[PDB]
Design a protein around this ligand. Sequence first.
Ligand SMILES: O=C(O)CCC(=O)C(=O)O
Ligand SMILES: [Fe+2]
Length: 253
Amino acid sequence: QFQYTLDNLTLEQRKFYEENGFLVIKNLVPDADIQRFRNEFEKICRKEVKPLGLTVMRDVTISKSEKMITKVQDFQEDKELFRYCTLPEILKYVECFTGPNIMAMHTMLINKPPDPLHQDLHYFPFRPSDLIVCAWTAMEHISRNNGCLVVLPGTHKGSLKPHDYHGIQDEENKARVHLVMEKGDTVFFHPLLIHGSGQNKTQGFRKAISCHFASADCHYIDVKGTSQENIEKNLKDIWMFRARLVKGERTNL
Ligand SMILES: O=C(O)CCC(=O)C(=O)O
Ligand SMILES: [Fe+2]
């Protein structure tokens, strides 16, 4: 052998990960913990809690204007949200991809409003991609109606494609899968897996929380002269300042 998983937790659901580049573990995060994430998000939403280095996207406004939160990133200095990263149920599985030295590298809570494909790695200037994993958990029932994740199975085996931005303007040849998930369900997936969110044709805001983890043994690459040049918009340091040791030891990242 396997390239995308290590030994052990897991069966020929390794064989699945290896052919597909994603794996869904049912009812992984307790209802209790999901509600705690919900609660903290809404406090942020009421400007009652103001975490330290947190980024807020308000990409939608509403009138009867006033802007609504649609994503928060870099919540590593917020305690209830950061428990997601430290949660032993999440880590018993993360280790299968990263190994025993684990860094929580990118944190998001996504609040998709009522209504494009990409590779998360476009944004990550660190390697090997095989020792990096996104852990993405449904904070409510997510189906095709409210914009669940779409994935192109097996594209984790292919190259890093160029992006404009949320970006790939092409390379398919395996039928898409819509990841309908229940509350607490978690999907694990590779940074080169081509994916996107479908339309949210409901009137509700659709919540998921997620983290990309990477082996501490990984390293930082220079993106000048590559497809990734654009992300710079030094970079090693912003990602170093953001990275948090979540298990084992901080070796190299
Ligand atoms: O809409 C989502 O839940 C995930 C968004 C996404 O794919 C990303 O930020 O990379
Ligand atoms: Fe993504």
